[PDB]
Design a protein around this ligand. Structure first.
Ligand SMILES: C#CCO[C@H]1[C@@H](O)[C@@H](CO)O[C@@H](O[C@H]2[C@H](O)[C@@H](NC(C)=O)[C@H](OCC=C)O[C@@H]2CO)[C@@H]1O
Ligand SMILES: C#CCO[C@H]1[C@@H](O)[C@@H](CO)O[C@@H](O[C@H]2[C@H](O)[C@@H](NC(C)=O)[C@H](OCC=C)O[C@@H]2CO)[C@@H]1O
Lengths: 133, 133
């Protein structure tokens, strides 16, 4: 499903983007995309509950000029179907830092050259309740 | 200009809460709501000192790119250099706009929208949080 799209976010390095949403009881996966536009993502954040052959795995990637980068997976899955979850994201030139429920945090390399994050899109089985910038 | 959001999927009776910062030198700010940028059920424009108005909220609609007839409100609970929250709901007949300090007004739903999918900010108001109830 296609969810909320925001543009002109003007999120600068060090600033925090917070997103709170409801994970569907029968959720299979959801996505938060961040970057410049739909073809230029410094972060594709994709928790997979049960999707693409994956169970309870966070998949991350980038997209540069339409081209998917090299996927990476994380080793903690602090999401439950049928619950509210918050995600908090910042960045600097080297990395995005993703803070999750249950104390967990990880970094994903920043493979694009964006001065600010201007675009966010949410998709899949996560109903956005609040965005704070 | 400011934040633009699409795919909001706001339905009748649901509450959209927008918090932000009114600039210290504010002259005017805008929240636009509707289907898309050409079809606005609400152009909400507090004018501190702008476009011929002092301390007046101007409201209008836009239907297929054409501005409607302006409505001016009777109240103005905004100050430059402050934080302010605006809360909006709608139904068949009207948008209801709840303002700081207990003020509220109605603006007719001229386009008869059954969903609000688009929001945009402009002017001397920086959005800091958007919430959906
Ligand atoms: C469009 C879109 C969003 O979906 C794709 C996106 O989530 C990317 C992120 O990298 O992954 C795509 O699926 C991958 C899948 O993750 C890969 N799995 C493994 C384990 O590496 C897969 O690998 C081949 C199988 C060993 O390739 C697919 C499709 O590209 C999402 O489709
Ligand atoms: C585009 C855009 C955003 O700005 C315009 C928008 O707010 C519309 C909404 O109807 O109003 C435009 O300004 C009017 C202004 O409301 C009028 N003021 C008065 C007091 O009638 C003005 O009248 C002539 C000057 C006293 O005309 C302007 C332009 O139509 C905003 O430009």
């Amino acid at each position: 499903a296609c969810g909320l799209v925001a543009s002109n976010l003007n999120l600068k390095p060090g600033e925090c983007l917070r997103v709170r949403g409801e994970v569907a009881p029968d959720a299979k996966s959801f996505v938060l995309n961040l970057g410049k536009d739909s073809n230029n993502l410094c972060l594709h954040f994709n928790p997979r509950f049960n999707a693409h052959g994956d169970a309870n795995t966070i998949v991350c990637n980038s997209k540069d000029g339409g081209a998917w980068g090299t996927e990476q997976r994380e080793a903690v899955f602090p999401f439950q179907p049928g619950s509210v979850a918050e995600v908090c994201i910042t960045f600097d030139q080297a990395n995005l830092t993703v803070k999750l429920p249950d104390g967990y945090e990880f970094k994903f390399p920043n493979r694009l050259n964006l001065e600010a994050i201007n675009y966010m899109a949410a998709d899949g089985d996560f109903k956005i309740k609040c965005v704070a910038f």
